[PDB]
């Protein structure tokens, strides 16, 4: 398991404008 990505998942957003 990847702790960093598990954490990032809570607030991930794509590169949109």
């Amino acid at each position: 398991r990847d702790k960093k990505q598990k954490a990032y998942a809570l607030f991930y957003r794509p590169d949109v404008v």
Partner: antibody
Amino acid sequence: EVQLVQSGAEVKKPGESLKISCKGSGYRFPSSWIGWVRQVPGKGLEWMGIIYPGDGETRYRASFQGQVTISADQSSNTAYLQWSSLKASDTAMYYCARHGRGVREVINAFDIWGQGTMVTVSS
Amino acid sequence: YELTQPPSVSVAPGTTATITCGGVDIGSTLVHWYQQRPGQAPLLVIYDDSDRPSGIPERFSGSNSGNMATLTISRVEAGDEADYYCQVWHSTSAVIFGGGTKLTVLS
């Protein structure tokens, strides 16, 4: 240079409305979260909400739901925090801060902070 | 969900300062640490448990595990005294700061 510049100090009375702003400079504004943090003078930091301007996604702490509104405008690179009916307890400093979008190429934390806006609500 | 910090911590110059942040299973998520000086906006000093921003000196480091995270300042200098806050992203709608800790470097 990456920078967040907030609006000047505010002195309001209870029951009034207010809208303070935080402008980003030196980076691509839509591709980073901007969060708002409250700090009563001499007390700790309290997180209120956060907004991603790219798609406008907005989250609030459960306490502040219906108490404030967070917004953003990409054409002007500006996030906003607004009260409809200010109350004395809202007196505090307010910071805006940039937070990464959950990717390794960026810092996924409040890596940049505005200088803060002092809001004084007294009758 | 609360993060528990000690209100105040004092250490001698040139020694190691440690500030502790307590949270339920805090070791499962990432912990960040911010330094705030009187009259100034916070400054990210450590992110993702132990990472240092480019400008921060190597004296700052972080740890996280179980129900305890830690900020460690080695060879602490007088200039380092300030308020320090731990912070995590617990739930989707809840970002949580610690109560804050006042660090004094004994003079």
